[PDB]
Amino acid sequence: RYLEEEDGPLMKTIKGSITGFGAGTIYGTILATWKDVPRVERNVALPGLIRTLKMMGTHGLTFAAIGGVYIGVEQLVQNFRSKRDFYNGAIGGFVAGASVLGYRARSIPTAIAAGATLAVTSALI
Amino acid sequence: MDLIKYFTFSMIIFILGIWGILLNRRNILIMLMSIELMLLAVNLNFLVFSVSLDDMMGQVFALLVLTVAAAESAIGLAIFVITFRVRGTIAVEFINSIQG
Amino acid sequence: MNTDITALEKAQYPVVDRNPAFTKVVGNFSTLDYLRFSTITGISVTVGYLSGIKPGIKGPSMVTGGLIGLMGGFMYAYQNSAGRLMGFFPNDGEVASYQKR
Amino acid sequence: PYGFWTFERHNAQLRWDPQISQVAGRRDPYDDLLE
Amino acid sequence: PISATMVGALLGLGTQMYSNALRKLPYMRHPWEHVVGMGLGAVFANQLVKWDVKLKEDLDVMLAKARAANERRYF
Amino acid sequence: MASGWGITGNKGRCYDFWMDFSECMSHCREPKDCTLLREDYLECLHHSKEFQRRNRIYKEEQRKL
Amino acid sequence: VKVLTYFGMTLAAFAFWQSMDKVHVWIALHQDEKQERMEKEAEVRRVRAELLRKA
Amino acid sequence: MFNLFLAVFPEIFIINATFILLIHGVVFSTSKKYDYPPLASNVGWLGLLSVLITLLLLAAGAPLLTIAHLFWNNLFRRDNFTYFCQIFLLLSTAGTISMCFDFFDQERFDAFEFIVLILLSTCGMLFMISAYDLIAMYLAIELQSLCFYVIAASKRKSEFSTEAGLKYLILGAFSSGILLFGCSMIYGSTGATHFDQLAKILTGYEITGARSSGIFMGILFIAVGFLFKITAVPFHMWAPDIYEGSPTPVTAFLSIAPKISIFANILRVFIYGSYGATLQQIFFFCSIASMILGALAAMAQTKVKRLLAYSSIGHVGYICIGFSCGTIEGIQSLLIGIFIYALMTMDAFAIVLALRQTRVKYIADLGALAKTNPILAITFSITMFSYAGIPPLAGFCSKFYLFFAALGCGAYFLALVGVVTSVIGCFYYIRLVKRMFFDTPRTWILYEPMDRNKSLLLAMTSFFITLFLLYPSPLFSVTHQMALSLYL
Amino acid sequence: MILSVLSSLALVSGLMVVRAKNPVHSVLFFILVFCDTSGLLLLLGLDFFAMIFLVVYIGAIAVLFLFVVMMFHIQIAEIHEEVLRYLPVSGIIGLIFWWEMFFILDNESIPLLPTQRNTTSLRYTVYAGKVRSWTNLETLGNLLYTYYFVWFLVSSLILLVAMIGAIVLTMHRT
């Protein structure tokens, strides 16, 4: 069922960071487009584009950090311990969630909640 | 390469309708016109395919879709008129009361 | 215009006439058919009268309701008569009159 | 089921199209030359 | 015993009383309507029983055909 | 081209292929039994394999030049 | 817009459509590699499912 | 020749009766002699009679609706599935009309054209059910949609009604264009629009490596249009705004009949055509999104109409779980869920229209209703517990299936979503029971008693809701019949 | 080449429909897009549809749009917005739709590449079809009112709904 791949832990981490950046760029574009423009900005176009691109870059960065650290810690767990399970990975989701989303939200309870949610989500898979 | 060129003509009109929706969040009249551009592109698709397949069903449906497009435009502009008459303006900030 | 009366589900009763003419189906109207016709028409006239009192048009409303009922009752009676002649409905009397004439 | 297409409800065109096979607008062009 | 006619008559009488109560009217306002409702409920219950019997027959015929079509696979 | 009505008032170019495929599918309880007729009909519709082969010829001509 | 602006946008669109013609010819020229790659991926799946059922 | 039209007798009758009513209304509403009488209730009663006569013609002519099936084949297809679907649609329309006379008389909504447009849309949905070709399907869908656009804007001086109509026209025309683009792709790729031809072309192959992308995207776009029609997330946001902004009888009508007709279309198009897995995954993912989003958004609502709109979105999610599994029991359960949701919604909107005489708007307006009208508070509590799926009420039946398919098609994430969203739904439904029974407000709203039509309809639907699980055999048998008749 | 000219004209005219500041100009550019479509239909040999697109889209529908828009006297402030910020989202959406749909036929309808050989000599002519040829008009009229008359009538019902709804929504009798 899974016998179509070539793997490579470093390649896995790089590709995951790249995919995370792409998804974060798409998400940032969507969020920037949903929002209205500040009233002081309705009559001038360029600052709106700058804010859209800034949102794109910031979301690409945070999503790339999550999508990289998740699999990086997943392999660095399954490499040293060298056991394949859903446990290996629950730790990666937790550390990605905690670190990145707590650096972003600046809150420790938010870090714990985000890591827990990512842990359950990666556990189901 | 004839079929691909006619097809891309119609496809560009369809994409222009989509972009016109995307680009006119303050202009609801242009949104209605973008929808009419999409409908025109679909009609073209049916006619081109009818020719390409030597089949008449694409032409029958093109005529009927014409009737539908006319009816849609008449009703759409009637609703636009009563919306404007009630509010005095067409600005999108006056048609956002229903929410949640 | 090419036509084909053939139904998806075959008639379960003796087929007296596959495609009976309009006047033949009308002439096949039975006592029960006229009872259905009259009941539908009378109910429709009554509804027209009763719903017309408040706007003040009970007479014209009566005529309108009666027209709707006349069309619906005639269509229902025709439906039953033609179904009997075609074998789709139980058609004892149709077969008894057919086996004799 | 096994071959729904096989059922007679699903073969309406195969029995109706022969009945209109001589109608102007869908004839083989040689049919007019021989008939 | 508990026939369809009695269940339907009780249901129709209950329907007329429920209607009167939802309109804040006395339960027995217009008793002739209670009689009419009893009759209509009886008729409806008996007809539902007959319709259910007919439905079962039609389903059996349909299920027979489906099983025949399925058994055709192993021919 | 499954309806039969051609755009110039005659039988459609691909109607006979459609009818062959349909008549095959009306009694063959397996769709794979009528695969050849199906791809005949679709080939009539789009001329995919014909044009692919002619493009092969053109490509070989360009290669030998 | 100015009339010259409409003319210039038309010229640019004409160039875009000729570029699309080149793209279509490129896609038409690579049908054979698509077919040969598809030969492999479908046959790999066959050799695969056949081997996975040997046990 | 005349006997061929026996297959279209119900439609012929309803269309001609609609014309008669249009003429009668316009002639006597303009009459100075009768002082321009309001004719909305008169034409309403005559149209209800017309619908009941149409129902008589259709139900008593079951074998005759299949006469001349080869002559009529390129136009429509009438069978047992269509027979029962059309009977149910006519019943829904009759109930909805009977629920409108108090609104006509007390708000003085005098426009009889309201009834005419409802009847014309009923014709359109009748043609939708028997549609057997993409062209006919689209035409019938457009007729129904245009009637709804016009009736959504019927209160033409109200800001809310004009706003509802405008959003409906734009989002509805957009979705219709998307669906029409899908039909064009399918036609171009297969050269066929008839459902039988599409069946023959597409069966046996699905995604056989060399998949026609034209067919696949025609299917995707048609599926997007259908999902807009059934208010599945993420194509749903038109529904709560239009449901609120439209006149309440319009909201009641839009809640039931279009769903019956569009689900008939979805069955006969998808279950019958053959692209397979992707089509069902579409509906699987949209069902999950609908359940979650409907539950949360309903939990956030403070107005009765919005709560009902979001509840309907959640329930279409539950129903579409049945279409996702793609089995006989899936179709049967979809049909059972549609029937029970329709009866429950008719109950709920009968109550809402009854309370609209004292202008109910907020959930808090129902405070102390168990004192001012105890039997109405019980009837409404029964409806809310039925909506929440508490056994042995009829609402349990649909909930039971959700978990039956989740453990049948082997899907435990679906089961978990169902458990959580069922709990959330139970909470926001029992919040209304708390408001009517447990609260002691300082200011009470006294409500006018309802008219006879709504009391009778409410009594019947409430007896059904409490007592269906005692005698559920006819619905089970008839839905099994319909599920089988989709293929044979 | 000719198809490239028509495609370019339609592309610019459509951009001007969706990007003009003034809605009156937008309706006028829409008339140009319909004229170009008529030209394409003439190329396909469908002269009836080419004329009907002129009669219905331009002669009747655009006129209604023009009457309504002109009498509305929309002010540019009520509908103005800067569109530079939408270049990324337009880019992603349009690029996905481009890469996926401008090339949907390519796998199914493979183009025939033009070679440096006269392939016109292999056109086979069948004269039997040319004895009494049918116009687009009579070919369509052979089907509309007989084999597919029900859809014709449903379209009439659609038009009736439009007339009723127009009267009911907007009429204020003097």
Q: Kindly determine whether residue I138 and residue F9, on different chains, have CB atoms separated by under 8 Å.
A: yes
The residue to which tokens 């969507």 are assigned: A30
Q: Which residues in chain D (4-33) have CB-CB distances under 8 A to chain C?
A: 9, 16, 19-20, 23
φ/ψ of E55, rounded to 5, equals -50, -45
Q: Kindly determine whether residue H6 and residue C40, on different chains, have CB atoms separated by under 8 Å.
A: no
D1/D21 Cα distance (integer angstroms) = 32
- Comparing CA positions, the residue from H360, H316, H323 lying closest to residue H342 is H316
Nearest CA in chain I to G12: I8
Q: Residues C75, H9: contact at Cβ < 8 Å?
A: yes
In eight-state DSSP terms, residue A42 is T
Does an interface of 3+ CB pairs under 8 Å exist between A and D? no
Candidate from H190, H192, H204 with C-beta closest to F31: H204
G42/G38 Cα distance (integer angstroms) = 6
Q: CB atoms < 10 A from the CB of A34, how many? A: 8
In eight-state DSSP terms, residue A38 is P
Q: Kindly determine whether residue C4 and residue D19, on different chains, have CB atoms separated by under 8 Å.
A: yes
Q: By three-state DSSP, how is residue H362 classified?
A: strand
To which H or E segment does residue H123 belong? helix H113-129
Burial of H358 (0-12, 13-18, 19+ CB in 10 A): exposed
Residues 6+ apart with CB under 8 A from I173: none
C39/H222 Cα distance (integer angstroms) = 46
I160 at the H interface (CB within 8 A)?
yes
Q: Kindly determine whether residue H157 and residue B86, on different chains, have CB atoms separated by under 8 Å.
A: yes
User: What are the start-end ranges of the H helices in chain A?
Assistant: 9-34, 46-80, 87-105, 108-123
CATH 1.10.287.3510 fits B2-87, yes or no: yes
Q: Kindly determine whether residue I131 and residue D24, on different chains, have CB atoms separated by under 8 Å.
A: no
Question: B53 to chain F: which residues are within 8 Å by CB?
Answer: 1, 12-14, 45
What residues pair up with H133 in beta bridges, in sequence order?
H194
Amino acid identity, position D31: D
Nearest CA in chain B to G25: B1
Report the alpha-carbon angle I146-I148-I152, nearest 5: 100
Amino acid identity, position B27: N
CA atoms within 13 A on the CB side of C72: 34
G37/D10 Cα distance (integer angstroms) = 38
**What is the total residue count of chain B?**
100
Q: How many helices (H) and strands (E) does chain F have?
A: 3, 0
Amino acid identity, position E21: A
Burial of I116 (0-12, 13-18, 19+ CB in 10 A): exposed
- Concatenating the DSSP letter of every residue in B45-90 gives HHHHHHHHHT-SHHHHHHHHHHHHHHHHHHHHHHHHHHHHHHHS--
Burial of I42 (0-12, 13-18, 19+ CB in 10 A): middle
B63/I53 Cα distance (integer angstroms) = 10
How far from chain centre, in Å, is Cα D24?
Answer: 14
H451/H449 Cα distance (integer angstroms) = 7
Q: Residues H256, H272: contact at Cβ < 8 Å?
A: no
How far from chain centre, in Å, is Cα H431?
Answer: 26
What residues pair up with F11 in beta bridges, in sequence order?
F5
H328 at the D interface (CB within 8 A)?
no
Q: By three-state DSSP, how is residue H133 classified?
A: strand
Q: Residues H201, H192: contact at Cβ < 8 Å?
A: yes
A47/A60 Cα distance (integer angstroms) = 20
Residues 6+ apart with CB under 8 A from H155: H109, H161, H162, H247
Q: Residues H51, H14: contact at Cβ < 8 Å?
A: yes
Q: Kindly determine whether residue C9 and residue H63, on different chains, have CB atoms separated by under 8 Å.
A: yes
Nearest CA in chain D to E72: D2
C76/C33 Cα distance (integer angstroms) = 8
Cα F32 to Cα B68, D1, D11, H203, I66: the distances in Å are: 40, 16, 18, 10, 57
In eight-state DSSP terms, residue H155 is S
The residue to which tokens 């992308």 are assigned: H213
Residues 6+ apart with CB under 8 A from H173: B32, B35, B39, B72, B76
Residues 6+ apart with CB under 8 A from A99: A65, A69, A111
Cα I158 to Cα B25, H60, H124, H148: the distances in Å are: 30, 29, 9, 12
Burial H383-404 (b: 16+ CB within 10 A, else e): bbbbbbbbeebbbbbbbebbeb
Q: CB atoms < 10 A from the CB of H209, how many? A: 9
- Comparing CA positions, the residue from B57, G47, B72 lying closest to residue H142 is B72
Whether omega for the bond prior to residue H392 falls within 30 degrees of 0, making it cis, is yes
Q: By three-state DSSP, how is residue H302 classified?
A: coil
Domains in chain I, CATH or no CATH each? 2-169 (1.20.120.1200)
Q: Kindly determine whether residue I142 and residue F48, on different chains, have CB atoms separated by under 8 Å.
A: no
Q: Which residues in chain G (25-54) have CB-CB distances under 8 A to chain I?
A: 25, 27-29, 31
User: What are the start-end ranges of the H helices in A35-45?
Assistant: none
B47/B32 Cα distance (integer angstroms) = 23
Q: Residues H274, H196: contact at Cβ < 8 Å?
A: no
Resolution of the structure, angstroms: 2.8
Q: Residues H260, H175: contact at Cβ < 8 Å?
A: no
Burial H160-191 (b: 16+ CB within 10 A, else e): bbbbbbbbbbbbbbbbbbbbbbbbbbbbbbbb
Q: By three-state DSSP, how is residue B42 classified?
A: helix
Sign of the four-CA dihedral D27, D29, D32, D34: negative
H59/H72 Cα distance (integer angstroms) = 20
Q: Residues F32, H178: contact at Cβ < 8 Å?
A: no
Q: Kindly determine whether residue H139 and residue B79, on different chains, have CB atoms separated by under 8 Å.
A: no
Whether omega for the bond prior to residue C60 falls within 30 degrees of 0, making it cis, is no
Question: C88 to chain H: which residues are within 8 Å by CB?
Answer: 63-64
Q: What is the nearest CA distance from C99 to chain H, expressed in angstroms?
A: 23
What residues pair up with H303 in beta bridges, in sequence order?
H362
Nearest CA in chain B to I90: B19
Q: CB atoms < 10 A from the CB of D30, how many? A: 12
G19 at the I interface (CB within 8 A)?
no
Burial C19-35 (b: 16+ CB within 10 A, else e): bbeeeebeebbeeebee
The structural domain count of chain H equals 1
**What is the total residue count of chain D?**
35
Q: CB atoms < 10 A from the CB of E4, how many? A: 17
Per-domain residue ranges of chain B:
2-87
Q: Kindly determine whether residue I134 and residue F8, on different chains, have CB atoms separated by under 8 Å.
A: yes
> Which domain does H270 fall in, by range?
1-488
